[PDB]
Design a protein around this nucleic acid. Structure first.
Ligand SMILES: [Mg+2]
Ligand SMILES: [Mg+2]
Ligand SMILES: [Mg+2]
Ligand SMILES: [Mg+2]
Ligand SMILES: [Mg+2]
Ligand SMILES: [Mg+2]
Ligand SMILES: [Mg+2]
Ligand SMILES: [Mg+2]
Ligand SMILES: [Mg+2]
Ligand SMILES: [Mg+2]
Ligand SMILES: [Mg+2]
Ligand SMILES: [Mg+2]
Ligand SMILES: [Mg+2]
Ligand SMILES: [Mg+2]
Ligand SMILES: [Mg+2]
Lengths: 131, 118, 60, 172
RNA sequence: CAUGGUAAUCCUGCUCAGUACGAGAGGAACCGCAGGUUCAGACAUUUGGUGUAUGUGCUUGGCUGAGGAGCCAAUGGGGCG
RNA sequence: CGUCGCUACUACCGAUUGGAUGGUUUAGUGAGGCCCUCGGAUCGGCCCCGCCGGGGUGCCCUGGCGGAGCGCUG
RNA sequence: CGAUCGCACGCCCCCCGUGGCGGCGACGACCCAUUCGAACGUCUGCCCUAUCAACUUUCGAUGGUAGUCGCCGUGCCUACCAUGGUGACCACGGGUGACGGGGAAUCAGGGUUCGAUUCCGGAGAGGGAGCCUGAGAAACGGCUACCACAUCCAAGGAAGGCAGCA
RNA sequence: AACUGCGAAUGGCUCAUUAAAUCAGUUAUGGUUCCUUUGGUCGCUCGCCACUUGGAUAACUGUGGUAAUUCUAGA
């Protein structure tokens, strides 16, 4: 196997990202990042394929006032792919997942980052197109 | 081992340069430098910018072998290349004997029929 | 990597497996229906130029 | 790998079907061994090679690799004639058919082992080398002898002896 | 070199191993491998940023009789560099 | 006969930009299809035309091979 | 402006003697008529609602005019001019637990309710939308896209529509 | 077995939608389409195979691929 590679973070905690799924949630307000030790005044950030948690702002009402685990699949901050190519997308997007990683919807809209894909096989199986 | 081509400027990008663009629709793009991607995000027609290669191609600033194969050599069941050749080349005044023999045989049968009916 | 070879003139078409990557370089990144030189295989594919009638992906 | 209705021809062809039930202690590769069985062969079955397979027809089985409910499978196989004179018993044709039930041999004694035993003629007792004869294996062969089921020993997991314990062949 | 300073740190995943142990549920460790956090020390090939090379275009108003060429408007703005 | 006192019911008002449900639409994006202009991976033939050739008699009937006419049409 | 396929088979022979002529069909067709129709049209006719009275007309509304397309008549749509059209004889808007009718129940007469349902017409084939072939489909026990569900999957893809019989 | 021709636009189910809309009666298409059936017409034109021209093509043989389909390819 092999663990992931460090990438440009570019997605701090205060950010607002959209859902690329069929669960009906639209907005996603990052709440924290799983596995970040932290630092002084350094607000933790996310990147593609990071297990984070976020709250939904706009979407289905019963789903709003809760904290859900999430993973990040899109971003408009670039990062080198260790092969000299820099990739970024239109928007920063993520898909709401349960704790273990099974994304709770059934479809993903738009493309996904390959690092996110092979980090999370379930979403890769569901991912529309890989990139 | 892949050398990409710029999605706007149409240039062979070498591995150490450029960036990628992935579109929410699914489309992917590659740009050479900041200039190219800024033009692209400006939705400018590259065939209008004066140094994009496709523009020159449109404006003509720069600058098939149909080889045939007619073969028939296969043999046919109940015969072979020799047998088909032999029965194809009785041209030198051998067909006629079989020809007239069949015609006369047909003529003899019709006279036989003439006798049978009358 | 299975190579299906065929003589339309003579039939006797059969299938062979190969793995020599250097062999595969010769017909890699080629158009279909392309006359390509397969003389690289063994010392006895000499004088044989071949045409690419197609092929089938790993997912059939 | 045949069609759905040809099970008839072999399935009424008496003295040719074989009914087995695999019985073992927990986690003893019953699933792994039966998956090895199903991979190559198949009356319709494919050749899946991804660890767990058709042995566990239920969730939270593959997510803990623990067998809960006994599952039956139909399988097929074509035999070479050397075995067709090897077979001492009555043999009719080459298309031998299997009715196999993988059954959990857990210490809870889920009576599924008993159900499989009742619906089968032969038992494939599976016992580990380095683990020795486990208690539940003794249990399952204890009902096997009581219900008059022909047992056959299928000892497993010698790779542990080879690599893990680095044991000697005579000690093996 | 007398001396003085001193710097590295922690956490994952694979493998070990679903193994030891345990009835079962459960369930590690060492060697090794691949990473990552914090800190430190550099550095600009690449990516970004800066940009008054006031580099080159575009453009507002005015001004040099106009074209060309330019200039002023406390960096005229703006695009790229 | 009313107020006040007790208990149940029933609706009403109610901050919460309550929430949900469909439809109608405004602006914006817009898969997909069809149409249009192109586009040309390929697949044909004429031009075969080096010829071996030749026949009404080197002025070919042509038997097939071979380049390629590097054109001309689909 | 028949390069077709069967079933009987026969007839004239001077020139002859191998050709010339005819039967029964079938399959054909450009088009006409007829039939099965279909489509759009004429007039009249529909439940409740005014705590719905003025609507419609930029974005066709009401026409004229020349056109596009359609199988055709027709702002179907486009381009230019006119400012029109409907309405207390209830327009418009809202609800309808409204598919319409033939009819059903009740029965002095009169009327009041019910007609989802075997007959007829219309519509739909999960909710939209677009198509190919076909004479005829905007078809769904046809295709394509989206949404919504939703099957298998070696995770690489493939396949769905019981408001048909059960 | 395949190619070809026709049918698959019938029927069956349900009434969600639908309030001069559908539908009922009436009446028009002299403003239109109509496979099929049936009856018409099919020498009306002057104009080097016709005693019959060309080319492909399934089915069929052989070689495969795919976890997998009424997926198919190559010869
Ligand atoms: Mg602070
Ligand atoms: Mg010191
Ligand atoms: Mg400048
Ligand atoms: Mg100026
Ligand atoms: Mg001047
Ligand atoms: Mg000037
Ligand atoms: Mg001055
Ligand atoms: Mg800049
Ligand atoms: Mg014929
Ligand atoms: Mg009703
Ligand atoms: Mg009816
Ligand atoms: Mg038809
Ligand atoms: Mg329909
Ligand atoms: Mg439809
Ligand atoms: Mg209704």
């Amino acid at each position: 196997s092999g663990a992931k590679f460090r990438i440009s973070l570019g997605l701090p905690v205060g950010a607002v990202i959209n859902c690329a799924d069929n669960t009906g949630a639209k907005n996603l307000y990052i709440i924290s990042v799983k596995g970040i030790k932290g630092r002084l005044n350094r607000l933790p950030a996310a990147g593609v394929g990071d297990m984070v948690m976020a709250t939904v702002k706009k979407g289905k009402p019963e789903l709003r006032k809760k904290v859900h685990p999430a993973v990040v699949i899109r971003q408009r901050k670039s990062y080198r792919r260790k092969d000299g190519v820099f990739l970024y997308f239109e928007d920063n997007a993520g898909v709401i997942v349960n704790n273990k990683g099974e994304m709770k919807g059934s479809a993903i809209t738009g493309p996904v980052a390959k690092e996110c894909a092979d980090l999370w096989p379930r979403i890769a199986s569901n991912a529309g197109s890989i990139a | 081992m892949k050398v990409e081509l710029c999605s706007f400027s149409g240039y062979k990008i070498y591995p150490g340069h450029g960036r990628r663009y992935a579109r929410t629709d699914g489309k992917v793009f590659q740009f050479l430098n900041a200039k190219c991607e800024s033009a692209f995000l400006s939705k400018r027609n590259p065939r209008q910018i004066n140094w994009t290669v496709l523009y020159r191609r449109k404006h003509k600033k720069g600058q098939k072998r149909t080889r045939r194969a007619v073969k028939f050599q296969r043999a046919i069941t109940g015969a072979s290349l020799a047998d088909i050749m032999a029965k194809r080349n009785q041209k030198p005044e051998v067909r006629k004997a079989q020809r007239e023999q069949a015609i006369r045989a047909a003529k003899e049968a019709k006279k036989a029929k003439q006798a049978s009916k009358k | 990597m299975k190579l299906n070879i065929s003589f339309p003139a003579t039939g006797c078409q059969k299938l062979i497996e190969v793995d020599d990557e250097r062999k595969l370089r010769t017909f890699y990144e080629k158009r279909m229906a392309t006359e390509v030189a397969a003389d690289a295989l063994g010392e006895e594919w000499k004088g044989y130029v071949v045409r690419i009638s197609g092929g089938n992906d790993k997912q059939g | 790998n045949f069609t759905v209705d040809q099970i008839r021809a072999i399935m009424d062809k008496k003295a040719n079907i074989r009914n087995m039930s695999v019985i073992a202690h927990v986690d003893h590769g019953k699933s792994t061994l039966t998956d090895s069985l199903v991979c190559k062969a198949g009356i319709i079955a494919s050749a899946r090679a991804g660890e767990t397979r058709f042995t566990d027809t239920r969730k939270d089985e593959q997510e803990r690799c623990i067998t809960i409910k006994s599952t039956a499978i139909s399988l097929f196989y074509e035999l070479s004639e050397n075995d067709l004179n090897f077979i001492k018993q009555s043999k009719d044709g080459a298309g031998f058919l299997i009715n196999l039930i993988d059954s959990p041999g857990h210490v809870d004694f889920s009576s599924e082992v008993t159900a499989a035993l009742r619906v089968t003629d032969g038992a494939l007792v599976v016992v580990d080398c380095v683990s020795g004869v486990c208690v539940q294996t003794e249990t399952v062969l204890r009902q096997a002898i009581a219900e008059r089921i022909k047992p056959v020993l299928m000892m497993n997991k010698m790779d542990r002896a080879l690599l893990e314990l680095q044991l000697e062949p005579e000690e093996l």
